[PDB]
Amino acid sequence: AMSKLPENFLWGGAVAAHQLEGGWQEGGKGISVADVMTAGRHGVAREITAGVLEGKYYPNHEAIDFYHHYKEDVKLFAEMGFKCFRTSIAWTRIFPKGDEAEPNEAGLQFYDDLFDECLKYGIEPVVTLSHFELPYHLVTEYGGFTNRKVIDFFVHFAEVCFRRYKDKVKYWMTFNEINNQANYQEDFAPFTNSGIVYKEGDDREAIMYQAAHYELVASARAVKIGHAINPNLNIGCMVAMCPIYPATCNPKDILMAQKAMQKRYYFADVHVHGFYPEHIFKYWERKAIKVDFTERDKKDLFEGTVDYIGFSYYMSFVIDAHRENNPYYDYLETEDLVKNPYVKASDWDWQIDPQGLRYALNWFTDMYHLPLFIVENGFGAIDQVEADGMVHDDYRIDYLGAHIKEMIKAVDEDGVELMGYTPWGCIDLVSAGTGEMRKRYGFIYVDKDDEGKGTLKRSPKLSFNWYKEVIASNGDDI
Amino acid sequence: AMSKLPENFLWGGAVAAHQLEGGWQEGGKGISVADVMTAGRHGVAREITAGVLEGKYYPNHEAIDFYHHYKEDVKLFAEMGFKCFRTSIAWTRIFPKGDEAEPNEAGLQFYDDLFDECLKYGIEPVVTLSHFELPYHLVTEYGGFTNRKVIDFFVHFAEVCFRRYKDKVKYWMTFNEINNQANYQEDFAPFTNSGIVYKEGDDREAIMYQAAHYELVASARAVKIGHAINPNLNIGCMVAMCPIYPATCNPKDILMAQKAMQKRYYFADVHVHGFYPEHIFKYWERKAIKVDFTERDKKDLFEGTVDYIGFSYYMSFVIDAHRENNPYYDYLETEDLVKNPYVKASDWDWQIDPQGLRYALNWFTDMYHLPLFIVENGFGAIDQVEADGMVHDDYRIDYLGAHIKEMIKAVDEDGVELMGYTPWGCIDLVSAGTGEMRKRYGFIYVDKDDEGKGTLKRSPKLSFNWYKEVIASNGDDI
Numbered sequence: 018a019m020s021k022l023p024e025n026f027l028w029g030g031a032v033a034a035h036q037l038e039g040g041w042q043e044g045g046k047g048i049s050v051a052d053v054m055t056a057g058r059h060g061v062a063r064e065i066t067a068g069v070l071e072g073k074y075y076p077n078h079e080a081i082d083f084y085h086h087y088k089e090d091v092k093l094f095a096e097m098g099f100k101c102f103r104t105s106i107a108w109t110r111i112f113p114k115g116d117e118a119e120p121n122e123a124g125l126q127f128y129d130d131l132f133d134e135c136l137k138y139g140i141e142p143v144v145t146l147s148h149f150e151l152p153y154h155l156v157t158e159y160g161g162f163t164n165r166k167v168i169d170f171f172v173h174f175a176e177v178c179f180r181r182y183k184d185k186v187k188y189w190m191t192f193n194e195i196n197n198q199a200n201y202q203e204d205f206a207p208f209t210n211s212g213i214v215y216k217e218g219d220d221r222e223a224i225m226y227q228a229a230h231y232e233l234v235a236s237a238r239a240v241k242i243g244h245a246i247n248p249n250l251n252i253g254c255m256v257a258m259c260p261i262y263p264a265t266c267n268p269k270d271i272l273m274a275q276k277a278m279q280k281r282y283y284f285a286d287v288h289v290h291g292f293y294p295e296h297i298f299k300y301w302e303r304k305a306i307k308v309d310f311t312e313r314d315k316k317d318l319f320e321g322t323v324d325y326i327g328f329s330y331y332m333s334f335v336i337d338a339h340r341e342n343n344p345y346y347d348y349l350e351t352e353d354l355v356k357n358p359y360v361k362a363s364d365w366d367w368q369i370d371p372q373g374l375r376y377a378l379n380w381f382t383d384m385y386h387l388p389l390f391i392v393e394n395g396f397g398a399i400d401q402v403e404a405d406g407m408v409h410d411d412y413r414i415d416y417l418g419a420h421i422k423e424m425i426k427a428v429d430e431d432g433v434e435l436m437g438y439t440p441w442g443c444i445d446l447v448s449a450g451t452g453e454m455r456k457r458y459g460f461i462y463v464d465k466d467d468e469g470k471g472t473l474k475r476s477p478k479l480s481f482n483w484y485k486e487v488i489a490s491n492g493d494d495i
Numbered sequence: 496a497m498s499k500l501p502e503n504f505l506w507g508g509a510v511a512a513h514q515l516e517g518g519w520q521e522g523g524k525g526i527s528v529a530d531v532m533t534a535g536r537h538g539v540a541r542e543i544t545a546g547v548l549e550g551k552y553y554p555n556h557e558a559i560d561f562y563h564h565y566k567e568d569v570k571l572f573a574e575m576g577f578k579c580f581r582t583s584i585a586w587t588r589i590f591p592k593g594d595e596a597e598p599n600e601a602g603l604q605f606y607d608d609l610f611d612e613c614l615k616y617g618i619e620p621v622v623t624l625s626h627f628e629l630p631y632h633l634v635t636e637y638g639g640f641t642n643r644k645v646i647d648f649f650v651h652f653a654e655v656c657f658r659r660y661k662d663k664v665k666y667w668m669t670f671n672e673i674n675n676q677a678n679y680q681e682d683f684a685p686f687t688n689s690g691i692v693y694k695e696g697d698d699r700e701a702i703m704y705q706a707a708h709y710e711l712v713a714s715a716r717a718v719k720i721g722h723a724i725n726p727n728l729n730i731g732c733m734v735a736m737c738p739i740y741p742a743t744c745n746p747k748d749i750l751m752a753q754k755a756m757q758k759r760y761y762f763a764d765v766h767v768h769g770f771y772p773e774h775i776f777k778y779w780e781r782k783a784i785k786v787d788f789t790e791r792d793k794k795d796l797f798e799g800t801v802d803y804i805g806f807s808y809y810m811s812f813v814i815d816a817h818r819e820n821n822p823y824y825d826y827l828e829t830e831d832l833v834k835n836p837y838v839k840a841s842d843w844d845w846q847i848d849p850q851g852l853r854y855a856l857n858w859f860t861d862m863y864h865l866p867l868f869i870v871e872n873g874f875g876a877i878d879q880v881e882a883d884g885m886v887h888d889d890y891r892i893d894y895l896g897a898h899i900k901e902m903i904k905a906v907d908e909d910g911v912e913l914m915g916y917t918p919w920g921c922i923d924l925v926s927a928g929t930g931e932m933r934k935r936y937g938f939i940y941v942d943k944d945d946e947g948k949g950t951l952k953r954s955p956k957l958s959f960n961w962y963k964e965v966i967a968s969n970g971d972d973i
C-alpha cells in the first residue's frame with residue numbers, strides 16, 4: 018500500500034539569500050548586485066544603480082529580516098513538515114569583495130547556524146552557490162563573469178563552502194537559472210546571472226556567451242572539487258525551464274520552437290554531456306562571436322558534469338515564424354513569442370500551464386536521463402488579509418496543486434526520476450524581477466509592504482495547512 | 496573553396512533485395528514474406544496469403560530482374576557517379592528456411608558478385624541485413640520474431656554476412672525501419688518487420704512489443720559479433736523518421752506529440768543508449784503487457800549499441816488530442832493523427848515537408864549525438880514517357896532538391912553530423928506498401944507495369960542527369 022511518489026520524496030520550500038535575509042551589512046557582508054537594485058513593479062523595470070545611492074529604495078537591504086528571524090521561520094517550515102529547505106549561501110557573506118585570500122568567518126558561521134537549525138527539525142538543506150547575488154566589487158573591479166579571473170574566485174568560494182558544510186549539506190547546485198541570461202536584450206539577466214554592466218557599443222550577445230562560458234567552466238571545476246571533498250555530495254545544475262511550444266503544426270513554427278529550445282537549453286547540454294552542441298559553434302560563426310575557450314576549459318567541462326538537473330518551472334511559452342527577415346531561424350525572446358490561447362495567466366502575465374511541467378519532466382528525462390529536482394514553482398499574486406486575520410489564497414492552492422498533480426503523473430505514469438519539489442518563496446519575500454513585496458508567493462504571510470512599512474510579523478495563509486497536508490499524505494491529498 | 500557538405504559525403508541510392516531482384520527461386524532461394532504478398536494499389540491493401548497461392552499475383556517474384564541485370568544497372572549508378580549503393584542481403588538467399596546449420600553458397604556468391612561490381616566503379620556497398628523479407632518458413636514454423644529462437648537465427652545470418660563481406664562492406668544496418676510496427680493496428684508492419692501473422696483474440700500490441708524486443712536484442716548481438724569480426728565496420732540502426740508535430744500549442748496536443756514520439760522512437764533509445772526508457776516499462780506495467788526480457792537481454796542491449804543512426808524520411812505527421820477516452824495519452828497511429836493543413840501531398844497522400852527533414856536531423860542530433868545517414872528519401876509518382884523517350888520528372892527533381900536543401904542547412908547551419916544521402920528506389924522497383932510498379936521513384940525508368948508486362952528495359956529520366964550534377968557538385972548545384 019504505497020503512494021505514487023517515493024517515501025523519501027524531498028518536499029520542501031525554496032528561497033534565495035538576498036531576497037529574504039536582510040542584514041545586508043551584518044557580519045562584514047559585502048555589497049552584492051542585489052544591493053544596488055531598486056524596487057519596481059509589473060511593467061516598470063528595477064533600476065540598476067552605480068552603487069548605493071541616496072534617494073533610492075533598495076528593498077533587499079532589509080528584506081524580511083530572516084537573518085534575525087530564521088529560528089522562528091524554520092519552526093514554521095517544520096510545522097508544515099518540510100523534508101528539505103532550499104536557499105543560497107550569500108557569496109558576499111563569505112567573500113565580501115570576492116577576491117579575498119581568506120573567507121569571512123562570521124558569514125560561514127551564519128550558515129552553520131542556519132543549517133544546524135534546519136537539521137534539528139529533520140530538514141535537509143539544499144544549497145545554491147550563486148543566486149543573483151555576486152559581490153558588486155567583482156563587477157566594478159573585474160567586470161564580473163566577463164573576466165576569466167572570476168572563475169577562480171567562484172571556485173574558491175565553492176571549495177570553501179563544500180569543505181565547511183561537507184557533512185551538513187547533501188544537495189548542491191552551482192548557478193541559479195544559468196540560462197536566464199540568454200535573454201541578453203534586457204539588462205536583468207546579464208547583471209544578475211553574471212555581473213555584466215553594458216556600455217554603448219557592446220555586443221551584448223557576444224559578451225553574454227563569454228560570461229556563460231566562464232560560468233559553465235566554473236560550475237564544472239566546482240563539481241569535480243566538491244566530489245573530491247565528499248564523493249557523496251549531490252551536485253546539480255539549475256536551469257529555468259520555460260517550454261517553448263510551436264504555435265501550430267506549420268513546419269516553420271515547429272523548427273522555430275526546436276531551435277529556440279536549443280538556444281535556451283544548450284546550458285543543460287554542457288552541464289550534462291560535458292561538451293557544447295555543434296549548433297552553438299555554428300551560430301557563433303555566423304554572428305562573428307569569438308569566445309575565449311581553451312583546451313583546459315574543454316577538459317574541465319568534460320570532467321565536471323552534474324549529478325542531477327535542478328530546475329524552476331512557472332510557465333510555458335509559444336513561438337511562431339511570423340517574424341520577417343529571419344532566414345537563419347534566430348530566436349528573439351522579446352519578438353518571436355505569442356500568447357497561448359489555451360491557457361490562463363497570472364496578474365504578472367505568467368502563463369499558467371501545469372501540464373507543461375509534465376512535458377518539461379519528460380523532455381529533460383528523454384534528453385538527459387538524470388534525476389530531476391523541481392527547485393522552484395509558485396504563484397505570485399496580490400494577497401489580501403481577511404477579517405479572520407488570514408489570507409485566503411485559494412488561487413495559490415489551485416495553482417500549486419495543479420502542478421503537483423502533473424508532476425505525480427510524470428513519476429507514476431511516465432517513469433521520470435524526481436528527487437523532490439520545493440515551492441518558491443515559501444515565506445513571503447522580495448521578488449526578483451520587480452523587487453516587490455506585493456507579488457506574494459508564500460505559505461507564510463509577512464507583514465511588510467512595498468513602502469517598507471509593516472511589523473514584519475509572520476502568519477500562516479490558507480495554503481499553509483493545505484501544504485502541510487500535502488506533505489503528510491506524500492501527495493495523495495491535494 | 497570548400498563546399499557546405501564534407502568532401503567524403505556518401506551520395507548514393509537505395510533499394511531492397513525483394514523489391515528489385517526477382518530470381519525469387521534462383522540459387523535455392525527460399526520463400527520470403529515478400530513472396531506471399533499480392534499486388535495492391537492506393538487504398539487497397541496487399542493480400543498476405545498463407546503460402547504462394549494459385550490465381551494470385553505476386554509482384555516480388557520477378558520484380559525488375561535485377562538479379563540478372565545488375566551489371567548493367569550498376570553501370571548506370573556509376574554513370575550518375577554514386578559514392579555508395581544501399582541494398583539488402585536477401586535473408587532467404589543465405590538461409591532459405593532460416594534454421595539451416597550452414598549458409599547457402601550460391602546466395603553468398605551472388606552478393607560477392609554484386610558487391611564486387613559496385614567496387615569496380617568505386618561504389619561503396621551499404622547493407623541492410625533485414626529488409627521486409629524474412630524467411631516465410633520462420634513464420635510458419637516458429638511464429639517469426641515472436642519466438643526467442645529466431646534471435647539466434649538472425650545473429651547466425653548476420654555473422655555469416657559480416658565474415659564473408661568483412662573486407663567489402665564498410666556500412667551495415669540491422670533491421671530496416673524497425674519502428675514501423677509501432678503501428679500494430681494494421682497487418683503490414685507487424686508482418687514485414689517481424690513475421691507476425693495475427694489471429695482472432697490476439698493482443699496485437701503485446702505481441703508486437705515482444706517481437707520488437709527480440710529484434711532489439713538480435714540487433715545488439717549482431718553489432719557485437721560484427722565488430723568482433725572487424726572492429727572497423729560501421730554498424731547502424733535504421734528507423735523510419737516521421738516527425739510527429741502537435742496540431743497546436745494546446746498543452747494537450749503538445750503532450751500527445753511528445754508521448755507519440757516516445758512510442759514511435761523508443762527503438763532508437765534502445766539502439767543508441769542501450770536501455771529501454773522508463774516510460775516503456777511503466778506503459779507495459781499499466782497495460783499488463785508481459786515481455787520475456789532477461790538479464791542477459793539487458794546486458795546484450797547495453798553492450799550492442801550502434802555506431803550511427805540510419806533513417807528514412809518521406810513525410811511528417813500531425814497529432815492532436817481529439818480522441819475521446821484516452822486519459823493516459825496512448826498513441827494510436829491509425830486514429831490520433833490528423834492532416835497538416837500547411838503542406839501539399841503526393842498522389843498516395845504522403846505529406847510533402849522538406850523542412851521536417853531538418854527537424855529530424857536536429858532531433859536525432861540533440862537526443863543522441865551520433866552520426867546520421869539519410870538512407871531513404873524519395874517521391875513516388877506516376878511517370879509518363881514523352882516523345883523523346885524520356886520521363887520529364889520535374890516533380891521528382893523538385894521534391895528531392897527541396898530535401899537536399901534542408902539537409903544542407905542542417906549540416907552547414909546546425910552542425911549535424913551527416914554521413915550521406917541515398918534516395919530511395921533510384922531504379923524503378925516494386926513498391927512496399929502497395930506492391931505497385933506505377934508508384935515510381937527512380938532516376939532510371941523501367942519498362943514494366945502492374946500487370947507484369949513490358950520489356951524491362953532501363954532508360955534515364957530527366958532526374959538522372961540532374962542527380963549526376965548534384966553529386967558532381969557535391970550539392971552546390973541543385
Ligand SMILES: O=P(O)(O)OC[C@H]1O[C@@H](O)[C@H](O)[C@@H](O)[C@@H]1O
Binds near residue numbers: 033450
Ligand atoms: O520573484 P519573481 O520575479 O516573481 O520570480 C520568481 C523566482 O523565480 C526565479 O526567476 C528566481 O530563481 C527567483 O529568484 C525568483 O524570485
Ligand SMILES: O=P(O)(O)OC[C@H]1O[C@@H](O)[C@H](O)[C@@H](O)[C@@H]1O
Binds near residue numbers: 511514627871925934
Ligand atoms: O514503396 P513505398 O510503399 O512507396 O515506400 C517507400 C519505401 O519506404 C520504406 O518504407 C521502406 O523501407 C521501403 O521498403 C519502401 O519501398
